[PDB]
Each structure stands twice: as structure tokens, then as C-alpha cells.
Design a protein around this ligand. Structure first.
Ligand code: FAD
Ligand code: NDP
Ligand code: ORN
Length: 413
């Protein structure tokens, strides 16, 4: 038994897809599909779901609405089905506590229980060759019990999210419970402290406020290479870059202009914090000046040069620019809120390397391939270079999903 499509992850990108495929199914027939996710109980970045994490995107830019507001899967319908719509309204906000967005996604997901396989991590994809042409694809995933699984599919779409970014100096410490990436924040905090946070982004700010608010025992240092925290920029003219119309424009630009646009707009999303959050962090420090009790430290300008483990704690050599001084501090724990990297060919797609072309991902999000390769491989979130800032986000999923299902059906038929 061969599957028309299989996807890697049933995160948002892939769910949005599932819905589109379902919408097309009535007109064009229903493909047999599966989406595997490595989470037994799926939470959307669960380890990051702290008390006051606000969706950084308008709820209207949910899974279906930009394409089809009349879908049963809109955030609003979800709210209605949970008898919460009126109440949400009295809220007057556009940005739901991310815990809520999570429920929505889980709820939407429950509607595809047949297509979703959870608890299965995909390890690699192998070509199945008949006559030197890749007719089908082999997907190898390992479940929670440790049992590997092999399935065969006509088409593949990979939407696994990103992998955490570890600065070099910390790579030495892989495996020390004492140091952990933000992404894994809830698991590790469940095990009087000094903790350090590395990075000046949202993930960094969110860790800090959470520690301050939830852990009185804790004193936190935010170590920033950058001078300050810069505000995420969401103004309307600017926000127009997360538009569906923009994907077209950016795609058609020469490589030089694309990067320019990406540089000019980096601040929409990366290394920036929400305006309200900065104040609140700013307020916290201000209060220290008042109280005179210096619990926390804002080490802007600081670069970690040496990090080493110890019986005592973790030793960091911090270079503070503008002082030029190098000083040593030791922390009970360190938190890396250094972000994510989405690099497309991991060990996961290696087996196909031979068939993947030089030219960039397709406008339709299909990787270009050899004439040898007859299957179709698609990716979501790995085309930021060519598809814009919207790519790694929730911004165009509704649209992107239509395009992809459109190709997939066209490929299949
Ligand atoms: C903490 C955090 C908050 C964010 N908040 C927002 C926001 O408010 N608004 C916004 O627009 N964007 C936000 N983003 C950006 C985010 O990338 C998108 O919102 C969205 O998560 C992208 O969806 P995705 O399905 O493509 O990837 P993901 O949501 O990361 O889905 C990938 C899923 O597949 C699993 N997986 C990974 N590898 C494999 C594999 N080997 N095999 C099987 N499963 C695998 C993962 O565990 C995960 O469940 C946020 C990102 C983070 C990290
Ligand atoms: N919806 C929500 O409430 C949340 C949304 N987010 C989203 O997740 C995505 C990524 O989040 P986040 O990781 O915070 O943002 P970024 O990945 O953009 O931020 C990374 C931070 O780490 C620093 N950094 C990276 N490498 C090093 C290094 N080698 N040495 C020192 N510092 C380093 C960067 O500093 P520098 O700028 O100087 O390079 C930067 O401040 C974004 O889309 C963000 O909006 C994150 C958390 C919650
Ligand atoms: N970091 C999320 C940015 C979302 C973007 N401002 C949008 O409106 O799509």
C-alpha cells in the first residue's frame, strides 16, 4: 500500500495543508495521506507555553481564513464551538494567549485523526527506484516504543519546524542538564538560583519575564551582545511584507534584492521583542533602581567567550564591550534563547541528495529534481530566502496550502 502523500510533522504548516486537501477532495477526489509527528501528545511548542505568551500574529491569520473564511476551522468557528466567542470578544484583543492557540490547533487536528500519526519521528526518506527513476519514497520513522516504521508514498512534504541554534561556545555542553535551549524550557525548569539567558529576542524576553514572575527564588541575567532590545515592528505599511501578494514579488526579485529586502525587514521578526514586553522588562529593571535590590542583571553588550561546566555551576567569561573588560560569572543554570535554524537538507533527506537540484525551491514549494525523480517533494518553512519572511510564520499558511495541494493534485493527476 502506497500513499499519495506523507508529511513530516503535523504542526501548523501541515495541518493547514490537510484542510486544503480536504477542501479539494470533493471536486477532485481524496488522496490517501498521512502526517507523522514526533509528539505523542501534540502541543504547539509546548515547552514554551508560559503564562503571558501572546500570539504574535493576528488571530485572523489563522489556519484557513485568508483562503476561506467560511471554513469550519477558522479560529472564530473554533471559539463558537467552544461557546467562547462572545467572551473572546469582550476581550478586545487580536492576540490570543498562545495556550489558546494551541487548543485551537489541537482541535482542528482532531478532525484529521485518520490522517495523523503521532508519536512517530521521521528518520530518513529513501528513494524507491524502478529503472533508475525514483517512483516512490520510503519513509522511515521510529515510534515512541522504539519500533521503526516504513511506509511508502507517492509524494512527500516536509514541514518539521526548525532546529535550535546553539552558539559554538556552548556546543561543548551538549547533554548537561544545567544548560538547555529555550525550546525545551518547561521540561528543564521542572528540574535559590542564578540562571542566565543568552539572546535578545522574544524567546529571550519571554524567558526572563517568566522567570521573574514565576520563580522568585531565581535571579536572572540577560546577556545581550546587542546593546538593547529592539521592538518587533508590526506597522501596517511594513506588515505588508507578510502579505500573500508579497510572496510573488519577492520571488521574482534577483537574489541581491531578496536579501536586501530580508535585511531591511529582519526586524519584523528576528532579534526583536514585542513592544509591550520591552516596557515590562524595562519596568522591572527600573524597579530595581527604586528598590535598590538588584536581583536581575541586564548585561547588554556582553559576549560569552568561554563556557565550562563545574561542580559549582557553569562558568562563563563575559566580555563587555565598551568596557572592554572580561569578567567571570558562574550560574546555576543557563538558558539559550538563541533561536532556530531552518536548514533544509539534514540527515533526513540525504538519500535524495543525488536527485535534488541546484535551483531553489519552486514557487509552488516543490523542490526541483532530476528527470529521474518522478515523485514530488515539497517543503514548508525552508524557503525564507526565496519566499519571504512569511515563510517561517503563520502568515500565509492558508494560501500556501492551497498552492501546494494544487500542485500535488496536479502532480498526482
Ligand atoms: C515559541 C515560538 C512561538 C512562535 N509564535 C509564533 C506566532 O505567535 N505567530 C507566528 O506567525 N509564528 C510564530 N512562530 C513561528 C512558527 O514557526 C510558526 O508559527 C509555526 O510553528 C510554523 O509551523 P510548522 O508546522 O511549519 O512548524 P512547527 O510548528 O514547528 O511544526 C513541526 C512539528 O513537527 C515535529 N517534527 C520536527 N521534526 C520532525 C520529524 N523528524 N519527524 C516528525 N515530526 C517532526 C515538531 O515536534 C513539531 O511538532 C513561533 C515559533 C516559536 C518557536
Ligand atoms: N508567539 C510568541 O509569543 C513567541 C514568538 N517567538 C517567535 O519565534 C521565532 C524565533 O524566536 P527567538 O529565538 O526569540 O528569535 P531569534 O531567533 O530571532 O533571536 C535569537 C537571539 O539570540 C541571539 N543569538 C544567536 N546566536 C548567538 C550567539 N552565537 N551568541 C550570542 N547571542 C546569539 C540573537 O542576538 P543577535 O540579534 O545579536 O544576533 C538574538 O537576540 C520568532 O519568529 C519569534 O517571533 C518566540 C517566542 C514566543
Ligand atoms: N513574528 C510574527 C510576525 C507576524 C506578522 N507581523 C504578521 O502580521 O503576519
Amino acid at each position: 500500500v502506497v500513499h499519495d502523500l506523507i508529511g513530516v510533522g503535523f504542526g501548523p504548516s501541515n495541518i493547514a495543508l490537510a484542510i486544503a486537501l480536504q477542501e479539494r477532495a470533493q471536486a477532485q477526489g481524496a488522496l490517501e495521506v498521512l502526517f507523522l509527528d514526533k509528539q505523542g501528545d501534540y502541543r504547539w511548542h509546548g515547552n514554551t507555553l508560559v503564562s503571558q505568551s501572546e500570539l504574535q500574529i493576528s488571530f485572523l491569520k489563522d489556519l484557513v481564513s485568508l483562503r476561506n473564511p467560511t471554513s469550519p476551522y477558522s479560529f472564530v468557528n473554533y471559539l463558537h464551538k467552544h461557546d467562547r466567542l462572545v467572551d473572546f470578544i469582550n476581550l478586545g484583543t487580536f492576540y490570543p494567549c498562545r495556550m489558546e492557540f494551541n487548543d485551537y490547533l489541537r482541535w482542528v487536528a482532531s478532525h484529521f485523526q485518520e490522517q495523523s500519526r503521532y508519536g512517530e519521528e521521521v528518520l530518513r526518506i529513501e528513494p524507491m527506484l524502478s529503472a533508475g527513476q525514483v517512483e516512490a519514497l520510503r519513509v522511515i520513522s521510529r515510534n515512541a516504543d522504539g519500533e521503526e516504521l516504513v511506509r511508502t508514498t507517492r509524494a512527500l512534504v516536509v514541514s518539521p519546524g526548525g532546529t535550535p541554534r546553539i552558539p559554538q561556545v556552548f556546543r561543548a555542553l551538549k547533554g548537561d542538564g544545567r544548560v538547555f535551549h529555550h525550546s525545551q524550557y518547561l521540561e528543564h525548569m521542572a528540574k535559590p538560583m542564578k540562571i542566565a539567558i543568552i539572546g535578545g529576542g522574544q524567546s529571550a524576553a519571554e524567558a526572563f519575564i517568566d522567570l521573574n514572575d514565576s520563580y522568585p527564588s531565581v535571579q536572572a541575567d540577560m546577556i545581550l551582545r546587542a546593546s538593547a532590545l529592539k521592538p518587533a515592528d508590526d506597522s501596517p505599511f511594513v506588515n505588508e511584507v507578510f502579505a500573500p501578494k508579497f510572496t510573488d514579488l519577492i520571488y521574482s526579485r534577483e537574489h541581491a534584492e531578496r536579501e536586501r529586502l530580508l535585511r531591511e525587514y529582519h526586524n519584523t521578526n528576528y532579534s526583536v521583542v514585542d513592544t509591550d514586553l520591552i516596557e515590562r522588562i524595562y519596568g522591572v529593571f527600573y524597579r530595581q533602581k527604586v528598590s535598590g535590590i538588584p536581583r536581575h542583571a541586564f548585561r547588554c553588550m556582553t559576549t560569552v567567550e568561554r563556557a565550562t561546566a563545574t561542580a559549582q555551576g557553569i562558568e562563563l567569561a563575559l566580555r563587555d564591550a565598551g568596557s572592554g573588560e572580561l569578567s567571570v560569572e558562574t550560574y546555576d543554570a543557563v538558558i539559550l534563547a538563541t533561536g532556530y535554524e531552518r536548514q533544509l537538507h539534514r540527515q533526513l533527506l540525504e538519500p535524495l541528495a543525488e536527485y535534488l537540484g541546484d535551483h531553489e525551491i519552486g514557487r509552488d514549494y516543490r523542490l526541483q529534481t532530476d528527470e529521474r525523480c518522478k515523485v514530488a517533494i515539497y517543503a514548508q518553512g525552508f524557503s525564507q530566502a526565496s519566499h519571504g519572511l512569511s515563510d517561517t510564520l503563520l502568515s500565509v499558511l492558508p494560501v500556501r496550502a492551497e498552492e501546494i495541494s494544487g500542485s500535488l493534485y496536479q502532480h498526482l493527476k
